[PDB]
Design a protein around this ligand. Structure first.
Ligand SMILES: *[C@@H]1O[C@H](CO)[C@@H](O[C@@H]2O[C@H](CO)[C@@H](O)[C@H](O)[C@H]2NC(C)=O)[C@H](O)[C@H]1NC(C)=O
Ligand SMILES: *[C@@H]1O[C@H](CO)[C@@H](O[C@@H]2O[C@H](CO)[C@@H](O)[C@H](O)[C@H]2NC(C)=O)[C@H](O)[C@H]1NC(C)=O
Ligand code: NAG
Ligand code: NAG
Lengths: 37, 50, 50
């Protein structure tokens, strides 16, 4: 069960801007009302 | 949980996310902790003052 | 029933989109509100303003 698909149209790649996306909590400590570098 | 210290423990209003156990202030000292048996948050305040 | 094909031309795609970007080592300045949530950040190498 393994196929090579077809009926696919050609197109160049597309790009977009990330408006301040992709930030995560860098530890498991609780912090409140602060600015941390 | 192995973290030793001295101070006064009081009931807290902070509310931890499930993956958090300790809370730290700007001087990086532990000022809040989740009790590992009752799952309640406590504030730790130093003892000397004045 | 609308995708005759055989098994390699009889398929419909659907609708979805996904975006990919790559991480690098940066210094950020995160802002925690009183509830402990990160609500804003500054990328310390984007501009001279930052
Ligand atoms: C799907 O297409 C690929 C080519 O894009 C086929 O690839 C070859 O596979 C054989 C083994 O079967 C290898 O010996 C060749 O070196 C491969 N060549 C390349 C360029 O990949 C693949 O067999 C196709 N599979 C199906 C089910 O159609
Ligand atoms: C840890 O064990 C203690 C008892 O050793 C449990 O405390 C009980 O908690 C329930 C609350 O649902 C009370 O009704 C009982 O009276 C408690 N027992 C005692 C002896 O105080 C505690 O629930 C245990 N930890 C967990 C996560 O269940
Ligand atoms: C992303 O990089 C490609 C590389 O050629 C460029 O064509 C495109 O304009 C860039 N997009 C933005 C938003 O800068
Ligand atoms: C957390 O702060 C938000 C505003 O930033 C507020 O709306 C919310 O009530 C607070 N959560 C509580 C009630 O602990």
């Amino acid at each position: 069960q393994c196929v090579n698909l077809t009926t696919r149209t050609q197109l160049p790649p597309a790009y977009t801007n990330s408006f301040t996306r992709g930030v995560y909590y860098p530890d498991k400590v609780f912090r409140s009302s602060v600015l941390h570098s | 949980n192995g973290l030793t210290g001295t101070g006064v423990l009081t009931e807290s209003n902070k509310k931890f996310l499930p993956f958090q156990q300790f809370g730290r202030d700007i001087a990086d000292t532990t000022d809040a902790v989740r009790d590992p048996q009752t799952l309640e948050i406590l504030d730790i305040t130093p003892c000397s003052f004045g | 029933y609308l995708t005759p094909g055989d098994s390699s031309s009889g398929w419909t795609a659907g609708a979805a989109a996904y975006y990919v970007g790559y991480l690098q080592p940066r210094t950020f300045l995160l802002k925690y509100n009183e509830n402990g949530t990160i609500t804003d950040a500054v990328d310390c190498a984007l501009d001279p303003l930052s």
